[PDB]
Scaffold this active site. Structure first.
Site, mmCIF file in Angstrom:
data_model
loop_
_atom_site.group_PDB
_atom_site.id
_atom_site.type_symbol
_atom_site.label_atom_id
_atom_site.label_comp_id
_atom_site.label_asym_id
_atom_site.label_seq_id
_atom_site.Cartn_x
_atom_site.Cartn_y
_atom_site.Cartn_z
ATOM 1 N N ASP A 7 -0.739 -7.666 -1.163
ATOM 2 C CA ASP A 7 -0.047 -6.432 -1.509
ATOM 3 C C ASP A 7 -0.514 -5.920 -2.866
ATOM 4 O OD1 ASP A 7 1.705 -4.373 -1.866
ATOM 5 O OD2 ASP A 7 3.502 -5.629 -2.118
ATOM 6 N N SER B 194 -6.768 11.412 -6.436
ATOM 7 C CA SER B 194 -7.622 12.003 -5.425
ATOM 8 C C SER B 194 -7.924 13.457 -5.784
ATOM 9 C CB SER B 194 -6.935 11.896 -4.058
ATOM 10 O OG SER B 194 -7.636 12.604 -3.051
#
EC number: 3.4.23.22
Length: 330
Positions: A35, A199
């Site tokens: 994770d 992004s």
């Protein structure tokens, strides 16, 4: 040193991925959920409340000659999906894919929430976010990667998750045969303890690319792609009959649909998520309403590039002094 381990979807939907991890001496192998959005290595154990164990493999520290109680240490964690667990702490030898760390904090669960109990395939979590998020008190502990880092050939790990198929976590090296083209690297902020990056935009299907900064985290422990409501609405508007359902808890779409791809930007590069990656199947057995793999992050407080996004790429988690993230197509 290096390590390399195969990671395997837990079910036909790729709801999560499990990777075998050797703990203790002799080894006890548990299948952990790696994770990159948390920083605790915790396991089902011989200390876990019996009624909260249902099929998981447990770690029994009393059977490990290298286990030592970390005296006075406790831990307690709550995840973004509302699940939680807590307990006490041992140090022990932990190996992943041939890479060994001695003295790793292994957090033994005394209590786990129902979602953990109900998932027989996940024996615990191995956190790969920054150690500043580790919950052990009163002495915070280091992640497996943080402990291994100085010994690694290069201070990196990579995630290569499969679509409906196994993939690979590598530590200490970049497998140049595992991706196509080049890897585009992008800046990381560690301020919130995550692999947080920005992004450069998105496209829906064959549509034009929208240049827009989208801050979010690379999180292998989250199943879906959670993005701003504007972006998510633009995606689902291209699927006839798709709608946000408050009763179901997100966007659903007719199972008869063909889903468009979704592209996200990494610098000037582009990662394409095929439409099929965005299908999470019937909302309940036999339903013709299917659950979407792109959902709004509104009310989470952060955008999350979860498995839906990451499995479309070869992803480098570069833990150099100034961390960065790399993405390649594959």
């Amino acid at each position: 040193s290096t390590g390399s381990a195969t990671t395997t979807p837990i079910d036909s939907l790729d709801d999560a991925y499990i990777t075998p991890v050797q703990i203790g001496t002799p080894a006890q192998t548990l299948n952990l959920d790696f994770d990159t959005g948390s920083s605790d290595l915790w396991v089902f154990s011989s200390e876990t409340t019996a009624s909260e164990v249902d099929g998981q493999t447990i770690y029994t520290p009393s059977k490990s000659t290298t286990a030592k109680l970390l005296s006075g240490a406790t831990w307690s964690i709550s995840y973004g999906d509302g699940s939680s667990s807590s307990g006490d702490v041992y140090t022990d030898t932990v190996s992943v894919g041939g890479l060994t760390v001695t003295g790793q904090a292994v957090e033994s669960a005394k209590k786990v929430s129902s979602s953990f109990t109900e998932d027989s395939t996940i024996d615990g979590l191995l956190g790969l976010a920054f150690s500043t998020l580790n919950t052990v008190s009163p002495t915070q502990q280091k992640t497996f990667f943080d402990n291994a880092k100085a010994s690694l050939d290069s201070p990196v790990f990579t995630a290569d998750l499969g679509y409906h198929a196994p993939g690979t976590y590598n530590f200490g090296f970049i497998d140049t045969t595992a991706y196509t083209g080049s890897i585009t690297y992008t800046a990381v902020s560690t301020k919130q303890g995550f692999w947080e990056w920005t992004s450069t935009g998105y496209a829906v299907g064959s549509g034009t690319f929208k240049s827009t900064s989208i801050d979010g985290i690379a999180d292998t422990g989250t199943t879906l792609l959670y993005l701003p409501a504007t972006v998510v609405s633009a995606y689902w508007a291209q699927v006839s009959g798709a709608k946000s359902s408050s009763s179901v808890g997100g966007y659903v779409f007719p199972c008869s649909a063909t889903l468009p791809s979704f592209t996200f930007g990494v610098g000037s590069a582009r990662i394409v998520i095929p439409g099929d990656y965005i299908d999470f199947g019937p909302i309940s057995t036999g339903s013709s309403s299917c659950f979407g793999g792109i959902q709004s992050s509104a009310g989470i407080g952060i955008n999350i590039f979860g498995d839906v996004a990451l499995k479309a790429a070869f992803v480098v988690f570069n833990g150099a002094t100034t961390p960065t993230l790399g993405f390649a197509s594959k």
